[PDB]
mmCIF file with all atom_site columns, C-alpha atoms in Angstrom:
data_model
loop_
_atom_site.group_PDB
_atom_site.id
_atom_site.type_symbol
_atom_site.label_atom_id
_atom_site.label_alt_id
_atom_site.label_comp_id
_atom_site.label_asym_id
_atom_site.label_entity_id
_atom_site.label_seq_id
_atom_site.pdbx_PDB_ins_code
_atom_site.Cartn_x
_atom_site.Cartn_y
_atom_site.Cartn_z
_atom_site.occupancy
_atom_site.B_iso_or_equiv
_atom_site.pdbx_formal_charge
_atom_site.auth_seq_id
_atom_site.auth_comp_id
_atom_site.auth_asym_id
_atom_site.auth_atom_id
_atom_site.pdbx_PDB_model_num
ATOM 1   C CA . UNK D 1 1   ? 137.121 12.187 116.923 1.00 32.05 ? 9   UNK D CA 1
ATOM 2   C CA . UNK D 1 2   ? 137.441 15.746 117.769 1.00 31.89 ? 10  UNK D CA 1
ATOM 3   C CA . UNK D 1 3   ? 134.495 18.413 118.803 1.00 32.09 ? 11  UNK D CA 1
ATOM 4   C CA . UNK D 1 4   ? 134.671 21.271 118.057 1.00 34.17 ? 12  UNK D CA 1
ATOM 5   C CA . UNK D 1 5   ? 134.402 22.046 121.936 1.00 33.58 ? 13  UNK D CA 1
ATOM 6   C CA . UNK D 1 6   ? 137.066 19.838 122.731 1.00 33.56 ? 14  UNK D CA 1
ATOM 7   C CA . UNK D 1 7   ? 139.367 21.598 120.654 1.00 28.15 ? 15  UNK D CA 1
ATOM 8   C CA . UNK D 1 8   ? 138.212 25.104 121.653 1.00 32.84 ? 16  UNK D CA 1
ATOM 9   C CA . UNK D 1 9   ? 139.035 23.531 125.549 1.00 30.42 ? 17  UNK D CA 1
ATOM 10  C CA . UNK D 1 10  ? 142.626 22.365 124.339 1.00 32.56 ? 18  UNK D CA 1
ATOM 11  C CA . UNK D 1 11  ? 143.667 25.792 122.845 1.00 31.33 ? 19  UNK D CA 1
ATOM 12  C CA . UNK D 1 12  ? 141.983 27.694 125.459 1.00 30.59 ? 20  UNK D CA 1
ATOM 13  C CA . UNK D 1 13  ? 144.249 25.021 128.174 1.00 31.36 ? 21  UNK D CA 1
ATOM 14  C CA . UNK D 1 14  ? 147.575 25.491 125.916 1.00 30.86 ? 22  UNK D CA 1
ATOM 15  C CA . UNK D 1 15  ? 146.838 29.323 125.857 1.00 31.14 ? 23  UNK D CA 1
ATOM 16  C CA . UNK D 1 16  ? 146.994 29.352 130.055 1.00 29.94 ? 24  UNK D CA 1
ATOM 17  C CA . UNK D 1 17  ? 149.965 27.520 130.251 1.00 31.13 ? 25  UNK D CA 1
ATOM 18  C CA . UNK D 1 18  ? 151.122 30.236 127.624 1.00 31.17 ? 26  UNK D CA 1
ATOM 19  C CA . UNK D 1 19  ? 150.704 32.989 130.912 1.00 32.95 ? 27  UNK D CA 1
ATOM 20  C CA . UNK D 1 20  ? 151.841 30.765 133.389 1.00 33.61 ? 28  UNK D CA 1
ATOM 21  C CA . UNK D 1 21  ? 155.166 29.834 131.468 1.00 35.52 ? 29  UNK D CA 1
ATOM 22  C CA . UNK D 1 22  ? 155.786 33.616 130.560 1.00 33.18 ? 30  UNK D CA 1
ATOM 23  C CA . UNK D 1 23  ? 155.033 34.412 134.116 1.00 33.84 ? 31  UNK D CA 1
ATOM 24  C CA . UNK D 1 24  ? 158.171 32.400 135.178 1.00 36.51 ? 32  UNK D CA 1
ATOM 25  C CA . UNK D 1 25  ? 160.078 33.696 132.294 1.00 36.33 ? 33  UNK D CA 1
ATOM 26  C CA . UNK D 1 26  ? 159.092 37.317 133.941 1.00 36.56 ? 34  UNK D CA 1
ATOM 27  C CA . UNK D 1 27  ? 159.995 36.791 137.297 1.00 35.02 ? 35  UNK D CA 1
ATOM 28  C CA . UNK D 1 28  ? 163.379 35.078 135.490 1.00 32.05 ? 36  UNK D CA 1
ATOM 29  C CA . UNK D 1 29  ? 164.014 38.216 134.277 1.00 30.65 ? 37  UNK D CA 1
ATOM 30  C CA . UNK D 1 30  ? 164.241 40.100 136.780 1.00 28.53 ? 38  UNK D CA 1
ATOM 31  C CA . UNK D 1 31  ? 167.758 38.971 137.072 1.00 32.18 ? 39  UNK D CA 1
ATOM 32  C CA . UNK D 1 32  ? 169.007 40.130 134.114 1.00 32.75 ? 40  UNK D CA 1
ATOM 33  C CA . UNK D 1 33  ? 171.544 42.791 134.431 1.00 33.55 ? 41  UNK D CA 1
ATOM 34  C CA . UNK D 1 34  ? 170.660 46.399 132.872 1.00 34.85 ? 42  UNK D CA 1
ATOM 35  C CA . UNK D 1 35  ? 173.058 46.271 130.639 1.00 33.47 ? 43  UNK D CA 1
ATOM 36  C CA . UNK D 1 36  ? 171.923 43.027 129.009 1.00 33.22 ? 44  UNK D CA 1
ATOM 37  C CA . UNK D 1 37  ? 168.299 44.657 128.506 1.00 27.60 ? 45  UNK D CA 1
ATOM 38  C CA . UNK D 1 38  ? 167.036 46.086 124.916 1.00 29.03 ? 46  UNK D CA 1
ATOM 39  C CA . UNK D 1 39  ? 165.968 49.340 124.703 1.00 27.45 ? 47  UNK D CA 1
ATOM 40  C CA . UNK D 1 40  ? 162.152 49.625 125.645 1.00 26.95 ? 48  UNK D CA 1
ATOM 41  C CA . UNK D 1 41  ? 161.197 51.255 122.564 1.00 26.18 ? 49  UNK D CA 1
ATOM 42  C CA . UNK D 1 42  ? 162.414 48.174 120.622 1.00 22.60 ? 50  UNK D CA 1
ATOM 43  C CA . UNK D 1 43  ? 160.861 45.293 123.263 1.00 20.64 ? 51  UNK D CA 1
ATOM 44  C CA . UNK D 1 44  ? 157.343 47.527 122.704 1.00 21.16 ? 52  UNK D CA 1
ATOM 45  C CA . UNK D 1 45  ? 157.289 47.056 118.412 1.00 20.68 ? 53  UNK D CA 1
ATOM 46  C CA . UNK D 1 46  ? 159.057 43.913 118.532 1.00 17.46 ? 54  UNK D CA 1
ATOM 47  C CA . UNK D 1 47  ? 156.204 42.500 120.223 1.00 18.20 ? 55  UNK D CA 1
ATOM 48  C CA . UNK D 1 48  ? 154.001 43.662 118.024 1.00 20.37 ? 56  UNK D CA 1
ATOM 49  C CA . UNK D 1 49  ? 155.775 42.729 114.799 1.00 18.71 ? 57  UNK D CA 1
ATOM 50  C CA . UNK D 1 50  ? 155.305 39.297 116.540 1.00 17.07 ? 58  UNK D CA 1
ATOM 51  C CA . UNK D 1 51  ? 152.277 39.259 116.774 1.00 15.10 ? 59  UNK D CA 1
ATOM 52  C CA . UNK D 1 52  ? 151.851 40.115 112.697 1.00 13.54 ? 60  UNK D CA 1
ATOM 53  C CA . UNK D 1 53  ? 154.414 37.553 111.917 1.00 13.00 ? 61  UNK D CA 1
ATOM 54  C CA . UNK D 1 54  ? 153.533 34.234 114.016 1.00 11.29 ? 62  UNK D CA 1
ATOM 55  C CA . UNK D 1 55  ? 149.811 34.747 112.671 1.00 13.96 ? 63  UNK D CA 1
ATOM 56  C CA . UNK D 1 56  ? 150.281 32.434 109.675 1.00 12.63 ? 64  UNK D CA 1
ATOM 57  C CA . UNK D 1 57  ? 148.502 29.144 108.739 1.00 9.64  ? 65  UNK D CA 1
ATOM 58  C CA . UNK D 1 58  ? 151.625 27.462 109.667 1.00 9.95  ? 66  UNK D CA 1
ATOM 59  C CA . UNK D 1 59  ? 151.701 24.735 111.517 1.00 10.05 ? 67  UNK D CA 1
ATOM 60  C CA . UNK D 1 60  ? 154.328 25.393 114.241 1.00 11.68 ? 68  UNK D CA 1
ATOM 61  C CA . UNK D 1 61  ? 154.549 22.689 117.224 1.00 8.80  ? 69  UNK D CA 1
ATOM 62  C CA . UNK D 1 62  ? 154.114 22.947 121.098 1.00 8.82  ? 70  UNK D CA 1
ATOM 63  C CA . UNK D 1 63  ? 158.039 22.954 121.878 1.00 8.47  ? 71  UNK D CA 1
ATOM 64  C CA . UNK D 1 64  ? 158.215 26.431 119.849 1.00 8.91  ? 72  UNK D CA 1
ATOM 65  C CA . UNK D 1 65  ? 154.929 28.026 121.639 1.00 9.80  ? 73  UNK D CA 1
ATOM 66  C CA . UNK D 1 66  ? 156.024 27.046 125.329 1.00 10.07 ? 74  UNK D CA 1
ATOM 67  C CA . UNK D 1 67  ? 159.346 28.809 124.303 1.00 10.16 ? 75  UNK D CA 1
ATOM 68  C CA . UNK D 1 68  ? 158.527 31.576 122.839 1.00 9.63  ? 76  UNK D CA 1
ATOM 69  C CA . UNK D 1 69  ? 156.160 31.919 126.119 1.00 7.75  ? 77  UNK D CA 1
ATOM 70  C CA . UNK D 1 70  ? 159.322 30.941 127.821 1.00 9.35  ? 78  UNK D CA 1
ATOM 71  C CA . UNK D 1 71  ? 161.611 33.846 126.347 1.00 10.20 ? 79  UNK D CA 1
ATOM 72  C CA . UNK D 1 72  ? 159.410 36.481 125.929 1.00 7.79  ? 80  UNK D CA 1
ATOM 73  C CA . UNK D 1 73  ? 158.374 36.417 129.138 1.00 9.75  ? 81  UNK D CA 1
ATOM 74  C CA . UNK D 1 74  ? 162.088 36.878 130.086 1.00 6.72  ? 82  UNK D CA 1
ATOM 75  C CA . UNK D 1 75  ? 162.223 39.993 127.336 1.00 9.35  ? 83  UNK D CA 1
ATOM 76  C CA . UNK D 1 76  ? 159.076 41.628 129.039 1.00 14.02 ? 84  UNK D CA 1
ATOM 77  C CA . UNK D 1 77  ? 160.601 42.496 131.948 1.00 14.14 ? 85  UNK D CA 1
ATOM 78  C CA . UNK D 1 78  ? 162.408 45.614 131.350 1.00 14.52 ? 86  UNK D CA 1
ATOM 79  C CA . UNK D 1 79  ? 159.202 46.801 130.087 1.00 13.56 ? 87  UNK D CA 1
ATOM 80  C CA . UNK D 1 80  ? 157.414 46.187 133.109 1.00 13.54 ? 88  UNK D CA 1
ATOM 81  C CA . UNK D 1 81  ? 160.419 47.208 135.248 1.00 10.99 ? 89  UNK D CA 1
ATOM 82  C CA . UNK D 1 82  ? 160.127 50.685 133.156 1.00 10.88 ? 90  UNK D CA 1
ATOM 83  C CA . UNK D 1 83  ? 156.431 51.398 133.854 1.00 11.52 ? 91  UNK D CA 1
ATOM 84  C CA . UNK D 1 84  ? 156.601 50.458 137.337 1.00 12.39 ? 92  UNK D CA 1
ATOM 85  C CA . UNK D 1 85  ? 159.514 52.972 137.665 1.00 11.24 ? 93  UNK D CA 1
ATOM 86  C CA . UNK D 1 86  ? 157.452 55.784 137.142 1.00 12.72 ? 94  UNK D CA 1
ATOM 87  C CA . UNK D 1 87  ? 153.828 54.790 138.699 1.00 12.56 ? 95  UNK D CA 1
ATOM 88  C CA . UNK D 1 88  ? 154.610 52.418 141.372 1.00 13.05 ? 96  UNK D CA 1
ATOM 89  C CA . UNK D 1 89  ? 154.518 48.510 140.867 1.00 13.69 ? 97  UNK D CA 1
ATOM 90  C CA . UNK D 1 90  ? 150.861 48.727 141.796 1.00 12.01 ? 98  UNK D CA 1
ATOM 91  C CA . UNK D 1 91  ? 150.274 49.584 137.787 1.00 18.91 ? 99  UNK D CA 1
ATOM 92  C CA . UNK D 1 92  ? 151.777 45.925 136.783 1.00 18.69 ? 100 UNK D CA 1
ATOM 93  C CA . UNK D 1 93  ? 148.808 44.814 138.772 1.00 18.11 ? 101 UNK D CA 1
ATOM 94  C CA . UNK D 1 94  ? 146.329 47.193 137.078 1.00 19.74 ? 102 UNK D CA 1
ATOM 95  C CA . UNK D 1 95  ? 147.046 46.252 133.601 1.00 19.15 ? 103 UNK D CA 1
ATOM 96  C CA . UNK D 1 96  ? 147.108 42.650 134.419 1.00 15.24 ? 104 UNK D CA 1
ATOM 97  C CA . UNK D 1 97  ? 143.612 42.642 136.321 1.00 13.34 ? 105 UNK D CA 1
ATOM 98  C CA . UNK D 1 98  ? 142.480 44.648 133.027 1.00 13.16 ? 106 UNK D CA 1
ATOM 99  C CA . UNK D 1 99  ? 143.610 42.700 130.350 1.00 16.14 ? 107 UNK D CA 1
ATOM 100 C CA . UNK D 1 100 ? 141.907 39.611 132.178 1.00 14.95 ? 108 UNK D CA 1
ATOM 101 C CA . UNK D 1 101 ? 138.915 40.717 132.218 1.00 12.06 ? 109 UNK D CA 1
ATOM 102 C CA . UNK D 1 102 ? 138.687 42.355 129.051 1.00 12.75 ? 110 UNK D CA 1
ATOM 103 C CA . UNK D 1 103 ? 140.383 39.012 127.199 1.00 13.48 ? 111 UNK D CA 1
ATOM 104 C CA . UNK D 1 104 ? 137.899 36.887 129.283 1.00 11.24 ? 112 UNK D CA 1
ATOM 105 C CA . UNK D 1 105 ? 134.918 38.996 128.742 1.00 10.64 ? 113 UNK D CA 1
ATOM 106 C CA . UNK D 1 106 ? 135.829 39.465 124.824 1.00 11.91 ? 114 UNK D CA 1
ATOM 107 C CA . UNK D 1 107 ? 137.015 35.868 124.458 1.00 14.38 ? 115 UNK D CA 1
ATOM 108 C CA . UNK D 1 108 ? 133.702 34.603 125.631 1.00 15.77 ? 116 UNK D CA 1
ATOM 109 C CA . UNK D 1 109 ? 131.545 37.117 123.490 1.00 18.18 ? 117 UNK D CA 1
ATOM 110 C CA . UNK D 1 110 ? 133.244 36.035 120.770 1.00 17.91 ? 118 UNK D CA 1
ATOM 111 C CA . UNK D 1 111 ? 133.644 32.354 121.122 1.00 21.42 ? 119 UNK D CA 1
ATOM 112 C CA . UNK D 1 112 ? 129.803 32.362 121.716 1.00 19.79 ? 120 UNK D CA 1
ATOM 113 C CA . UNK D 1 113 ? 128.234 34.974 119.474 1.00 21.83 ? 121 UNK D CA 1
ATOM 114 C CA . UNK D 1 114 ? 126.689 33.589 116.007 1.00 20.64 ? 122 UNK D CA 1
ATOM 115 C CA . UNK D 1 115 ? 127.688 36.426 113.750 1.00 22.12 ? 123 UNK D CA 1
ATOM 116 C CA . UNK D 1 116 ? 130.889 35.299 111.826 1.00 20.24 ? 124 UNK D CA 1
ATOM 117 C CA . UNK D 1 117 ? 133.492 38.333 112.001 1.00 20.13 ? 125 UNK D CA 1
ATOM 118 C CA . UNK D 1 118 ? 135.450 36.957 109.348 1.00 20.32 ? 126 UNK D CA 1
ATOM 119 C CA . UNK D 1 119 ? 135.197 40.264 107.103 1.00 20.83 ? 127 UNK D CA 1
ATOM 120 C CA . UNK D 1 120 ? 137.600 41.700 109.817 1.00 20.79 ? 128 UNK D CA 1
ATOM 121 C CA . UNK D 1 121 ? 140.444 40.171 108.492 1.00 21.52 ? 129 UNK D CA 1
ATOM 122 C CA . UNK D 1 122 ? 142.226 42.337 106.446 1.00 19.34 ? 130 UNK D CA 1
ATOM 123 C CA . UNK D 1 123 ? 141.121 45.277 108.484 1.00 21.96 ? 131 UNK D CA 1
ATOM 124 C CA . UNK D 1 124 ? 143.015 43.935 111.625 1.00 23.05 ? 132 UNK D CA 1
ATOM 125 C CA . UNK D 1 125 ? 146.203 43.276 109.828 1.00 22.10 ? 133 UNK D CA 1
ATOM 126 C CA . UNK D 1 126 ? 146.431 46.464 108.587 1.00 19.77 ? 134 UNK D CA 1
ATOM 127 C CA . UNK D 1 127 ? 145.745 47.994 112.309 1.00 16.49 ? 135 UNK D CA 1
ATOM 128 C CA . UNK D 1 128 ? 148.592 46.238 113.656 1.00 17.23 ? 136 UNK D CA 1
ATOM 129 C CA . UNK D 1 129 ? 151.462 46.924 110.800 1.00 16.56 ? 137 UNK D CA 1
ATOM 130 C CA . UNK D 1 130 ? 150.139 50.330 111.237 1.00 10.62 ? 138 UNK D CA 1
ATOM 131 C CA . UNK D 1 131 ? 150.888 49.940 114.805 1.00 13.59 ? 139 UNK D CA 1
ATOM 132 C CA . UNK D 1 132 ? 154.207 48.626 114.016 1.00 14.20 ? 140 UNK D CA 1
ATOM 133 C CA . UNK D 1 133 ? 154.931 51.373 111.479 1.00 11.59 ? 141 UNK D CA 1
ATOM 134 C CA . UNK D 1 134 ? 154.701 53.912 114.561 1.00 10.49 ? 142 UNK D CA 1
ATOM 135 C CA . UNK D 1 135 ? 156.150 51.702 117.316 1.00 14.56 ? 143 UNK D CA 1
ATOM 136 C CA . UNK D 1 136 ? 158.951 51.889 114.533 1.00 12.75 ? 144 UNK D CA 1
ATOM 137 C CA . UNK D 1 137 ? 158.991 55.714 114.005 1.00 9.64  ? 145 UNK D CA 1
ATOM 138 C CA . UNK D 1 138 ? 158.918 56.253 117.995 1.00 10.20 ? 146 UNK D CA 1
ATOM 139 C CA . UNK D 1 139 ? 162.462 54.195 118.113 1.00 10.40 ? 147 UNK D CA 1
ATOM 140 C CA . UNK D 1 140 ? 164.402 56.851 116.212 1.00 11.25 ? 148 UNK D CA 1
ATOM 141 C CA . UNK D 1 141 ? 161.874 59.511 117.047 1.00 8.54  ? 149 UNK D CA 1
ATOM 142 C CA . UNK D 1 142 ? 160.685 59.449 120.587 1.00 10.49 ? 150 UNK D CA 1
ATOM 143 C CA . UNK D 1 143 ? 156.901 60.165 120.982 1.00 9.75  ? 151 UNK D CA 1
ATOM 144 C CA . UNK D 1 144 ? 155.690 62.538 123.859 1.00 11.94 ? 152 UNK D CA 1
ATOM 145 C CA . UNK D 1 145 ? 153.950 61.149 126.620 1.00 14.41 ? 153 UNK D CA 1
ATOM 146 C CA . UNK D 1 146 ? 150.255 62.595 125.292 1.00 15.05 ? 154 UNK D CA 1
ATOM 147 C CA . UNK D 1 147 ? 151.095 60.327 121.608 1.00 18.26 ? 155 UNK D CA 1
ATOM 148 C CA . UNK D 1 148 ? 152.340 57.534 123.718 1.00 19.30 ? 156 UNK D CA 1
ATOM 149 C CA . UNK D 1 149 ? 149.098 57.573 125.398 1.00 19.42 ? 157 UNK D CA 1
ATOM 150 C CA . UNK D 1 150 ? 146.855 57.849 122.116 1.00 21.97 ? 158 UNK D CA 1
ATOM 151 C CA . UNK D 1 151 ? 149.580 54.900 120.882 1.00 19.68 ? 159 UNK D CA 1
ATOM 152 C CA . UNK D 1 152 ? 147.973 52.552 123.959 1.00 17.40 ? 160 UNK D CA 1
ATOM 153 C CA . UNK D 1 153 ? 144.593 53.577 123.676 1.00 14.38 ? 161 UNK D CA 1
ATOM 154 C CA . UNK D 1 154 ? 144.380 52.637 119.690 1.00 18.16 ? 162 UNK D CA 1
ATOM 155 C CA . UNK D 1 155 ? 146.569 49.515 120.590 1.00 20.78 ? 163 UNK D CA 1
ATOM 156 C CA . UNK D 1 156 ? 144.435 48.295 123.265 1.00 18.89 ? 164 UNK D CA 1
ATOM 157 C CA . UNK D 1 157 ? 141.120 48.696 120.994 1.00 18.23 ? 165 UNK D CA 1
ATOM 158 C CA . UNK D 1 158 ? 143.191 46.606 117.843 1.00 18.49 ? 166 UNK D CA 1
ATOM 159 C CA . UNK D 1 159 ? 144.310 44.271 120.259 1.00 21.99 ? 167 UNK D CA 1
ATOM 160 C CA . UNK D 1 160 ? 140.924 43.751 122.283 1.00 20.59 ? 168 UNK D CA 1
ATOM 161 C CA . UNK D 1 161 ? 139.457 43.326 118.767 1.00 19.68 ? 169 UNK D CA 1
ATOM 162 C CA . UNK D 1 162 ? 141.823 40.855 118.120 1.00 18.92 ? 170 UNK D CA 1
ATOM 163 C CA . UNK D 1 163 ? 140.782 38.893 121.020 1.00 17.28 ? 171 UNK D CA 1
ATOM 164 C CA . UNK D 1 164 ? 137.365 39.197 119.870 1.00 14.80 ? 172 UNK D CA 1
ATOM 165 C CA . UNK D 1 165 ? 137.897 38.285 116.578 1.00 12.73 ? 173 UNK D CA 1
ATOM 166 C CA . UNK D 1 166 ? 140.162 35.104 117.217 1.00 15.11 ? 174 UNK D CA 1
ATOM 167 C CA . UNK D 1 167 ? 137.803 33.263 119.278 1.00 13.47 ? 175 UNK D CA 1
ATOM 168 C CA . UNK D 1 168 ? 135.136 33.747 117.006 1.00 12.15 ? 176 UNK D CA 1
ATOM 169 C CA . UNK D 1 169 ? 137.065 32.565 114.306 1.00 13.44 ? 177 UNK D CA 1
ATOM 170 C CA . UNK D 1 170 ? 138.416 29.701 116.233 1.00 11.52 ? 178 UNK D CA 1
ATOM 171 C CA . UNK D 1 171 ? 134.917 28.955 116.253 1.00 11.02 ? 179 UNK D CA 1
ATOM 172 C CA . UNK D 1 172 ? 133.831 29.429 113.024 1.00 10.24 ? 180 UNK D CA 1
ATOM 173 C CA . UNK D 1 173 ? 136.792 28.037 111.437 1.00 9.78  ? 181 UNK D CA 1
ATOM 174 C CA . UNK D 1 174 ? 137.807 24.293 110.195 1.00 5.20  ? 182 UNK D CA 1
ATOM 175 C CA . UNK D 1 175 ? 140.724 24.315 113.218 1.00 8.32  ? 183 UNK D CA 1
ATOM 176 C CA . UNK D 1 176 ? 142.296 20.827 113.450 1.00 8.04  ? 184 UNK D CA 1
ATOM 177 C CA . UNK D 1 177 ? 144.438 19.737 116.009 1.00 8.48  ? 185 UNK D CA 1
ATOM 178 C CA . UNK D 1 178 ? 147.790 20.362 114.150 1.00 8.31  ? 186 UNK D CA 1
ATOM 179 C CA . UNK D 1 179 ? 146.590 23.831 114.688 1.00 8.18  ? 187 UNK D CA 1
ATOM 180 C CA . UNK D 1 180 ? 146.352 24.098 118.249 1.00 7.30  ? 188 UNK D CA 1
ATOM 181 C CA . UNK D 1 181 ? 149.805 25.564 119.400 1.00 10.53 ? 189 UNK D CA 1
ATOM 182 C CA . UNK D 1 182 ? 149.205 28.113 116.445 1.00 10.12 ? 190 UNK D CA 1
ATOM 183 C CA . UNK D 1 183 ? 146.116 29.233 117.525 1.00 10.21 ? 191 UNK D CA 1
ATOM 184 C CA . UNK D 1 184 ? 147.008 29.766 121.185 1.00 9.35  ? 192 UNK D CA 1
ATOM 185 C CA . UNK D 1 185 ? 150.419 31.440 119.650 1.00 4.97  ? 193 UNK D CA 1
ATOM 186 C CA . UNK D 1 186 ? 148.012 34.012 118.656 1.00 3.68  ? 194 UNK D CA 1
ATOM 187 C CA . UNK D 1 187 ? 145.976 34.659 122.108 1.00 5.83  ? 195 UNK D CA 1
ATOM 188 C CA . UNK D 1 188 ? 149.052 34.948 123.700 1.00 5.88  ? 196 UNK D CA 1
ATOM 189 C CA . UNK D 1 189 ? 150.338 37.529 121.794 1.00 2.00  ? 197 UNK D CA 1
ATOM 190 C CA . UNK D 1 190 ? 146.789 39.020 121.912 1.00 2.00  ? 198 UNK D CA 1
ATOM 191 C CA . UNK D 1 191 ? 147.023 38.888 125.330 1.00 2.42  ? 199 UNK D CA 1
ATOM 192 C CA . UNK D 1 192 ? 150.859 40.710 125.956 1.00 2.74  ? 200 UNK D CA 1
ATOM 193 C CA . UNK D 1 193 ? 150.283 43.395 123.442 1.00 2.00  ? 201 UNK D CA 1
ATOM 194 C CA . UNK D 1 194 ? 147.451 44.010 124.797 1.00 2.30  ? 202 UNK D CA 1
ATOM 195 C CA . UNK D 1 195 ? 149.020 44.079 128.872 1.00 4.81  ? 203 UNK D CA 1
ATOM 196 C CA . UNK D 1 196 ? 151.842 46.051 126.960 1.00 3.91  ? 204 UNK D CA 1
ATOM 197 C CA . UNK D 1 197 ? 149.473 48.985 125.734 1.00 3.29  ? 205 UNK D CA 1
ATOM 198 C CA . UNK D 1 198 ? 147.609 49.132 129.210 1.00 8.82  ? 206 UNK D CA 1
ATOM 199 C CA . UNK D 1 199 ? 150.809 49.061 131.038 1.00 10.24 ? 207 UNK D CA 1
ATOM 200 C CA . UNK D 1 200 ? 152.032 52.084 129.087 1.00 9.20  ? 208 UNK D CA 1
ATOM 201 C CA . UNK D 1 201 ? 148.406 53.718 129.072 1.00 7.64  ? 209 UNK D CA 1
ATOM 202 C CA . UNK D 1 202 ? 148.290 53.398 132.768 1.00 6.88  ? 210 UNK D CA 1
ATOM 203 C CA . UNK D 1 203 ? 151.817 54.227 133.556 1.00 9.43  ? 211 UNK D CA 1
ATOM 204 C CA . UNK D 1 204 ? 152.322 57.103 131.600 1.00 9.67  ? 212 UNK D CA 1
ATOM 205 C CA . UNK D 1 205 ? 148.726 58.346 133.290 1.00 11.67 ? 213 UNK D CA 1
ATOM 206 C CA . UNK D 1 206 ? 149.813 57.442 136.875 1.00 13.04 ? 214 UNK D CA 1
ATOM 207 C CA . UNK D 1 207 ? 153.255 58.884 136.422 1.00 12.88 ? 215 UNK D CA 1
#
């Protein structure tokens, strides 16, 4: 029989594999020719469409997580290619050591803290479609480099929310085994979106 530590520990184990398997997938990508890459403004919102869509109390299996860790770690290259273009790959390194701490430091506070953030529900979901809805506009019209950087900084507090909010909830919840891969589907996707927006926040700055 389950705990409900033991299944916090399981999520929080499939959830690292989650980085490790898109950090192959990254360094795969490296390979791929430039003419095979999307567009960056279309890697950015599809990423965060993704993150909207996969958070569904559905069921979906560890095959399908690992994947989409797999592949999307291969798609995020030519976004961190782009950023490390014009600040020096030394920014990569930045946002990475940032989004660590701030998903291990928010992931603990909320995993531990008694209030029940539950009422944030419908509040996030409408941050990130709104987030969506611009990442959408700035495909067909480009935003500036001083919206782009108001873009990351909204985007990294919805996102570092996010990462607040799901641990909590994974603790507060009834979360049953079948929902493991789901539930780590999430932090991942917490966890790139939120890399994405620093990487852009601190590019764009050191560029």
């Amino acid at each position: 029989h389950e705990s409900k530590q033991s299944i916090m520990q399981r999520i929080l184990t499939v959830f690292v594999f989650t980085l490790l398997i898109a950090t192959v997938g990254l360094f795969i990508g490296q390979f791929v020719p430039v003419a095979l890459m999307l567009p960056l403004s279309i890697l950015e919102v599809a990423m965060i469409i993704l993150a909207f869509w996969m958070r569904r109390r559905k069921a979906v299996g560890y095959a399908f997580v690992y994947t989409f860790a797999f592949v999307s770690g291969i798609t995020l290259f030519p976004i961190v290619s782009h950023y490390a273009s014009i600040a020096g790959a030394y920014v990569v390194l930045e946002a990475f050591g940032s989004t660590f701490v701030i998903f291990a430091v928010l992931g603990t506070i909320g995993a531990k803290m008694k209030k029940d953030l539950s009422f944030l529900w419908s509040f996030l979901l409408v941050a990130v479609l709104a987030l969506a809805v611009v990442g959408i506009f700035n495909i067909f019209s480009p935003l500036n480099s001083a919206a782009m950087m108001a873009y990351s900084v909204i985007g990294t507090i919805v996102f570092s929310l996010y990462i607040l909010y799901d641990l909590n909830q994974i603790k507060h919840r009834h979360i049953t085994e079948d929902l493991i891969p789901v539930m780590a589907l999430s932090l991942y996707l917490d966890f790139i979106n939120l890399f994405i927006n620093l990487l852009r926040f601190f590019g764009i700055l050191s560029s």
